[PDB]
Amino acid sequence: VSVVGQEHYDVATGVQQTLQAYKSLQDIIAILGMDELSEQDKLTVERARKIQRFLSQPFAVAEVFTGIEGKLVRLKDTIASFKAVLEGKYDHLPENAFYMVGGIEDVVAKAEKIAA
Amino acid sequence: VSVVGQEHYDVATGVQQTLQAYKSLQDIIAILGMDELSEQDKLTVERARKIQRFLSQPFAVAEVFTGIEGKLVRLKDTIASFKAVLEGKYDHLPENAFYMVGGIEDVVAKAEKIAA
Amino acid sequence: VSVVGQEHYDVATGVQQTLQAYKSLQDIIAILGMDELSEQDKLTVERARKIQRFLSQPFAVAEVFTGIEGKLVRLKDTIASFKAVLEGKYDHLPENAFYMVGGIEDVVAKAEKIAA
Amino acid sequence: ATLREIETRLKSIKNIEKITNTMKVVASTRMGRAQRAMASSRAFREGDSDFFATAETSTPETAEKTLIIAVSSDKGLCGSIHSQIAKATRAKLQETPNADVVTIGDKIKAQMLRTHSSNVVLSFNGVGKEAPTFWEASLIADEIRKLGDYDKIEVMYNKFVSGVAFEPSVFPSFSPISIEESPKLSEFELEEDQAIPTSLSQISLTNAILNAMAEGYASEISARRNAMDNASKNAGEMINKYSILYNRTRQAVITNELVDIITGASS
Amino acid sequence: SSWQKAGISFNKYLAIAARTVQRSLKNDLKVAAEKRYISDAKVQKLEKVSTTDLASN
Amino acid sequence: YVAVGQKRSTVAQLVQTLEQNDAMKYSIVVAATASEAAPLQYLAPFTACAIAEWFRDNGKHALIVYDDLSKQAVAYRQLSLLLRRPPGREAYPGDVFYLHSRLLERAAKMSDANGGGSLTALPVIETQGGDVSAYIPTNVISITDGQIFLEAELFYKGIRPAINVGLSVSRVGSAAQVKAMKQVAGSLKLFLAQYREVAAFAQFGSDLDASTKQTLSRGERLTQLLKQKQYSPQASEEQVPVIYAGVNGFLDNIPIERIPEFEEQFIAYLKANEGDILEAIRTKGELSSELLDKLKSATETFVAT
Amino acid sequence: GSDLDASTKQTLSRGERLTQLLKQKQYSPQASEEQVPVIYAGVNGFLDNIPIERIPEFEEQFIAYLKANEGDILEAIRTKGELSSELLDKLKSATETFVAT
Amino acid sequence: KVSLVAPHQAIFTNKEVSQVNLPASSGEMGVLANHVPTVEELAPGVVEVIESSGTASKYFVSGGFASILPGSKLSISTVEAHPLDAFSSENIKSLLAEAQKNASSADETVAAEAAIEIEVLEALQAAV
Amino acid sequence: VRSSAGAVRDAGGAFGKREQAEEERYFRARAKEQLAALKKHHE
Q1: How far out from the chain centre does Cα E29 lie?
Q2: Which member of F171, F196, F218, F258 is catalytic?
């Protein structure tokens, strides 16, 4: 918190806590199912899948294997997009809109084009 | 298929595919049970157990350790008995009627004597 | 029975059989209660609780931690006290009368002084 | 069968044993609350349907096939819960395969579609999660797609005969034409102006649906506790066998690695 | 009453009278009583294994 | 602090942080990087223990921190393999268990006839993948009188630091602690052990009973209150007031997310309103009958806002 | 036990037919002109209406009809090694008409 | 001897009663000792069962079926059975005002359900 | 006691393959309902 700031420290701790909690809840769904999850456990499973695909961006050197163009996100755009998804501002969007995208601007454009 | 024919090649691939599906799902049948399967997995588990016991024939040299007579099935009789059990013609018989027997003639005679 | 005699072998086998049955029945008593049993299961569960605390006597060097005196039971006194409790001679005594005691004489003096 | 493969299999089997033991303890607490609802439904069924026993209400000939209702659940992991309900309805449908089937669960509708897909006329999902009440039984009876135009109306469910095992029972439901054609139906002071035959016949369908759902939920919860205890006991035997193999592989890995360093240093 | 003219019988009249009497009484005495007036079962009329409109509520 | 096996950048960053907080004036630093020979890194444990033994033999106290114990074992085995010697288990010499037990047994507490000094040994055992029963991990845990385990799964959840209560234990017990902190640690040990075994029922909160709901609410507030930030140590008077409010039942009415804000608000209000209760718990080090009644009245009046 | 997902029925049926069509026998190699016509009918959904057991007979019948009738489409994929706008429209129309015997 | 059992709990259960002035479908009738077998329906009224002396419990039943067996057994099977003190006077006036305004204002079963609810709310408020 | 943070998906056997298929089937069904509701709200 003394190098990246107080705002960037809370975003890194919140993303690590949600990803670690999803591993323990995934073991119970393989034996009991989704009926044992409540309202808080159901929203945490959907937010953990979208946060893992949003961090994977297409590189410029790997354009021959992926096919899409390369995207480069800055440091200020990556911290603002991760804090808005953890609060409840992008809960209505799908998981395919954040996969192989850039920041918060590329996630909103991919959701409107996939629904048409 | 160029040495044993097209009929013997299809019977060998179908019998090996049913035993591989039941062996990979052994972690769920030994922990949760056989009731956790679906409709397609339940029929494949019953046919795999009868096909494994039908291939074990009593040899002539092991008559003092088993008590039964020696069975020597031919190449044409073994291919016709495995294709009829995998198509659904011997699904009403028990699993003990094919254990330590010969071909298709010995499996029908053992099921009638045990039900009398 | 060839090293400790026939009398010591019968008392050791009876105490080990009652303790093994009470330990395995601990999972069924917490989910079905204590009154949902038969006549033979209810009498064996009451005697098993007092027999587990009768074998734990207070040592002479541990008098500053428990407050009770040190009891040094011999081999003949320990075999006579365990055989009388398994036959029904001490079935009317309480479960706390055998705790922190040693021998057949210590159980009769602690039970009569607890109430009056 | 190396050191990394034995550690991943032993750690995954230990997590399944803790989830199976926690599910069995949670099933025991839910069985106590469900036992009070099953006792109240059994006492109310003997008093509300007591007029049909004294009047001898029975069916006769078939009128436009019949109507079957298979009450079950939508979730699994309950042992032979869906298998026993599907086997009982298939045996009674041999003499009358032209009757309709109304499945009240995802587990009963999946097994009935593989044998008689054309006989399924109604499908209800979302009833095996929470406990049954009077609102769920009254809503399914009014929207059963003309339930009063059948001669026989059976309710296939699972009756808990004990506190460990169960059995698949059945209860018949009379229509409006069979309630007024009883033997001693005129023994009570019933008003002929208002609806008395059609009202008492439709009320028995909602009362029997609530008793079958309460008894079926208690039997499914009791069967799930036995399956969870068997899964936790089977996981302990597999963890004990894997621990013996991991202990022998750990000692063999230390002897094989020390033999390679001793052979290279002596040459 | 005149409930026989509509599509409500003795089963529908008893459920509507019991739910209306609970809401008109004391508001603090509604413990373990609101769950007996709501459900989530969707009755889907199947035909031939297709189905029609999944009616609920 | 005996840095053994670390790089050059790790030794310079640790010495700069201690000088800014006035902590390097009375702390010995034994620099022993991995860029030197194998004789300098293997003798770093014996050289650091000899300099710290002068304070314990005079009348003062010392505290050695061998960081790390895994790096010291690799330096001793490297010099023995090149001197034409036979090896043993995990490519180590015959005196593998005697090399770590001889340097750890010298840090003991002397009696009153020798001077009254003591010496603490804090060896850090760097494990592989959480396996505490290895070759060098089992030899350092059997010779020491206690071990503090640290798992990688609890550090990413929110526990700072990740200290497992079910795996870490001390052989001294409550004999080497203050009397004021021992009264609150007795009741907290039984509540933390019962909540860990029943932690699997937290996913099904709609089927909790009376005794199950009380253990889950009290166990979650006690684990979150002990989580502190980096370079933020507390004294004995501030930790005794925070442990008494969670063990009695004064923190059960607050939420789980408000556990971080309640630790700073209760510590700041106790230093301006009830300063006599915090100063008496540090000087005397115990709690009499008058200290228990005054602490319960101050915590109940501050929990209403 | 899941039998729903109407949108996933097209992807599940096309995946089983694509794996059986790509499995060749021993000493039976294919060229670039015969492999380009078989991969286009399985990826565009033209092989979803055929059976699973007739996947072996459909590969030999499609290659034989393209060598005697529309022989110009098979020679252009091997010489040029690509397909432009005119080659894509001629390959899609010949594959749809050959599915109905 | 009464058997007033509801669909959630049992009130009378065992046979330990004498009089039962429960509102049936016709009028405010009352079962005595060995009454005639009248298996008539019950309406939303006050089911006060006089136990021997004046220990009657004003159970506000919402309707059901008062079955009378031939062996002096009265099985008053209703849907709900709440006491008179379990209904607040402040919340009872709000339900009667909302049902009167919604009646004769829409279509389908909205006007039919509001007319039956206004009659049951007026009888329970006058017996407080 | 022992570490088991995500040991089911890290094994890769029968329990590991069933956990990944159950999560992918539930996410595919929820994506169809979210995409259809977003297109109707924009017009």
Answers
A1: 21
A2: F171
